[PDB]
Design a protein around this motif. Structure first.
Motif, mmCIF file in Angstrom:
data_model
loop_
_atom_site.group_PDB
_atom_site.id
_atom_site.type_symbol
_atom_site.label_atom_id
_atom_site.label_comp_id
_atom_site.label_asym_id
_atom_site.label_seq_id
_atom_site.Cartn_x
_atom_site.Cartn_y
_atom_site.Cartn_z
ATOM 1 N N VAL A 103 0.832 -1.200 0.000
ATOM 2 C CA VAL A 103 0.000 0.000 0.000
ATOM 3 C C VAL A 103 0.886 1.279 0.000
ATOM 4 N N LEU A 104 1.938 1.288 0.816
ATOM 5 C CA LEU A 104 2.848 2.452 0.888
ATOM 6 C C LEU A 104 3.514 2.688 -0.490
ATOM 7 N N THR A 105 3.924 1.603 -1.132
ATOM 8 C CA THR A 105 4.510 1.672 -2.500
ATOM 9 C C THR A 105 3.526 2.336 -3.498
ATOM 10 N N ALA A 106 2.275 1.851 -3.482
ATOM 11 C CA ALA A 106 1.196 2.356 -4.346
ATOM 12 C C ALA A 106 1.031 3.852 -4.074
ATOM 13 N N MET A 107 0.993 4.216 -2.796
ATOM 14 C CA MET A 107 0.815 5.629 -2.453
ATOM 15 C C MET A 107 1.918 6.538 -2.994
ATOM 16 N N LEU A 108 3.157 6.053 -2.956
ATOM 17 C CA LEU A 108 4.323 6.860 -3.346
ATOM 18 C C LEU A 108 4.700 6.787 -4.827
ATOM 19 N N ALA A 109 4.185 5.773 -5.532
ATOM 20 C CA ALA A 109 4.554 5.536 -6.936
ATOM 21 C C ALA A 109 3.379 5.439 -7.899
ATOM 22 N N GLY A 110 2.173 5.246 -7.366
ATOM 23 C CA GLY A 110 0.975 5.144 -8.200
ATOM 24 C C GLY A 110 0.962 3.898 -9.080
ATOM 25 N N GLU A 111 1.667 2.852 -8.656
ATOM 26 C CA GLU A 111 1.711 1.584 -9.380
ATOM 27 C C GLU A 111 2.101 0.472 -8.416
ATOM 28 N N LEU A 112 1.666 -0.738 -8.730
ATOM 29 C CA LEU A 112 1.991 -1.894 -7.888
ATOM 30 C C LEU A 112 3.267 -2.500 -8.446
ATOM 31 N N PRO A 113 4.170 -2.957 -7.569
ATOM 32 C CA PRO A 113 5.464 -3.431 -8.078
ATOM 33 C C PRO A 113 5.438 -4.766 -8.847
ATOM 34 N N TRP A 114 4.536 -5.681 -8.484
ATOM 35 C CA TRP A 114 4.431 -6.985 -9.165
ATOM 36 C C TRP A 114 3.007 -7.569 -9.093
ATOM 37 N N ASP A 115 2.696 -8.473 -10.031
ATOM 38 C CA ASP A 115 1.407 -9.160 -10.069
ATOM 39 C C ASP A 115 1.288 -10.083 -8.862
ATOM 40 N N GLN A 116 2.432 -10.609 -8.411
ATOM 41 C CA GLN A 116 2.519 -11.491 -7.218
ATOM 42 C C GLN A 116 3.978 -11.680 -6.840
ATOM 43 N N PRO A 117 4.255 -11.904 -5.529
ATOM 44 C CA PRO A 117 5.615 -12.033 -4.991
ATOM 45 C C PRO A 117 6.202 -13.418 -5.229
ATOM 46 N N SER A 118 6.427 -13.744 -6.503
ATOM 47 C CA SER A 118 7.023 -15.035 -6.877
ATOM 48 C C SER A 118 8.296 -14.806 -7.690
ATOM 49 N N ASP A 119 9.279 -15.664 -7.464
ATOM 50 C CA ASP A 119 10.552 -15.599 -8.187
ATOM 51 C C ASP A 119 10.334 -15.727 -9.692
ATOM 52 N N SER A 120 9.212 -16.327 -10.081
ATOM 53 C CA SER A 120 8.857 -16.446 -11.500
ATOM 54 C C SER A 120 8.447 -15.076 -12.041
ATOM 55 N N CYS A 121 8.264 -14.127 -11.125
ATOM 56 C CA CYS A 121 7.866 -12.766 -11.480
ATOM 57 C C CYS A 121 9.112 -11.894 -11.616
ATOM 58 N N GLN A 122 9.417 -11.466 -12.842
ATOM 59 C CA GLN A 122 10.614 -10.680 -13.115
ATOM 60 C C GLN A 122 10.763 -9.451 -12.204
ATOM 61 N N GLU A 123 9.675 -8.715 -12.005
ATOM 62 C CA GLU A 123 9.722 -7.513 -11.170
ATOM 63 C C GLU A 123 10.114 -7.882 -9.730
#
Ligand SMILES: CCn1c(=O)c2c(C)n[nH]c2c2ccccc21
Length: 268
Positions: free
Chosen positions: A185-205
């Motif tokens: 939520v803090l990330t979304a507030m400060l950047a206006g975007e979510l960092p990843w679709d899900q917290p998995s190593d298969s997720c590049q972000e």
């Protein structure tokens, strides 16, 4: 005594459904969550335990056959989600103030042994003075009872907000999961975007974050101080993850940034 005081007009669809209800006599406003039972019991049970300024107030519930009506505090400022500008976020001082209020609500819930399990901007409402209130205890559960902690195992929540242990481990502590979603939520507030679709190593972000590539997107938009806090919250190992008492000691958390709500003044 006063004849029509129990009558509420349902005036508008807030978001079963949530209706804005206005008292026929007093014109007081409340939100009415209407649920077609055809979880609710748990949700009502949990709401009856709650009393805090950063938690949506529960006024009561009424049967009426198969329909359940939950009377809740109306938050005229709407969802926090709507205060986040896409790709930008919001002013840092505003994000800090909402984050302080969010931590206050979470500390309160954890203190009474309750985990929300679905913290995200859609479930964080704002009152008339922009005070944040945690809403929707539909997915909430008791994680501590008679002073004994119960480990969780049910997969609950919303992918982009969920902690990585819920995807990788059979059992996990409740509290670090809520801390993690507060970080997103803090990330979304400060950047206006979510960092990843899900917290998995298969997720590049997600792998990029673990490799500390903060010259990348949402990270590059932050500021070093709140980013250092995020580095402490978004830690894969929940046992190593920062706790709330330590978040309250963080440098950014304690940085003076925002003036209080401006009050009327004149000059002579
Ligand atoms: C539709 C989501 N939603 C609610 O659930 C709710 C509650 C509960 N109180 N106030 C509100 C509310 C107020 C403005 C907009 C959406 C809202």
């Amino acid at each position: 005594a006063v004849p029509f005081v129990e009558d509420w007009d349902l005036v508008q669809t807030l978001g079963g459904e949530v209706q804005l209800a206005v008292n026929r006599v007093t014109e007081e406003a409340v939100a009415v969550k209407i649920v077609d039972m055809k979880n609710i019991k748990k949700e009502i049970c949990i709401n009856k335990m709650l009393n805090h300024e950063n938690v949506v107030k529960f006024y009561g519930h009424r049967r009426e056959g198969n329909i359940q009506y939950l009377f809740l505090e109306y938050c005229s400022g709407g969802e926090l989600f709507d205060r986040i500008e896409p790709d930008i976020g919001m002013p840092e001082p505003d994000a800090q103030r909402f984050f302080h209020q969010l931590m206050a609500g979470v500390v309160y819930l954890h203190g009474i042994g309750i985990t929300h399990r679905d913290i995200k901007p859609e479930n964080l409402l704002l009152d008339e003075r922009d005070n944040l209130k945690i809403s929707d205890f539909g997915l909430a559960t008791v994680f501590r009872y008679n002073n004994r902690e119960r480990l969780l195992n049910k997969m609950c929540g919303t992918l982009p907000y969920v902690a990585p242990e819920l995807l990788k481990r059979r059992e996990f502590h409740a509290e670090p999961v809520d801390v993690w979603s507060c970080g997103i939520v803090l990330t979304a507030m400060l950047a206006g975007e979510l960092p990843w679709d899900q917290p998995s190593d298969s997720c590049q972000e997600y792998s990029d974050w673990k490799e500390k590539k903060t010259y990348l997107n949402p990270w590059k938009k932050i500021d070093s101080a709140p980013l250092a806090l995020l580095h402490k919250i978004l830690v894969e190992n929940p046992s190593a993850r920062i706790t709330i008492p330590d978040i309250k000691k963080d440098r950014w958390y304690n940085k003076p940034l925002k003036k209080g709500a401006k009050r009327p003044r004149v000059t002579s």
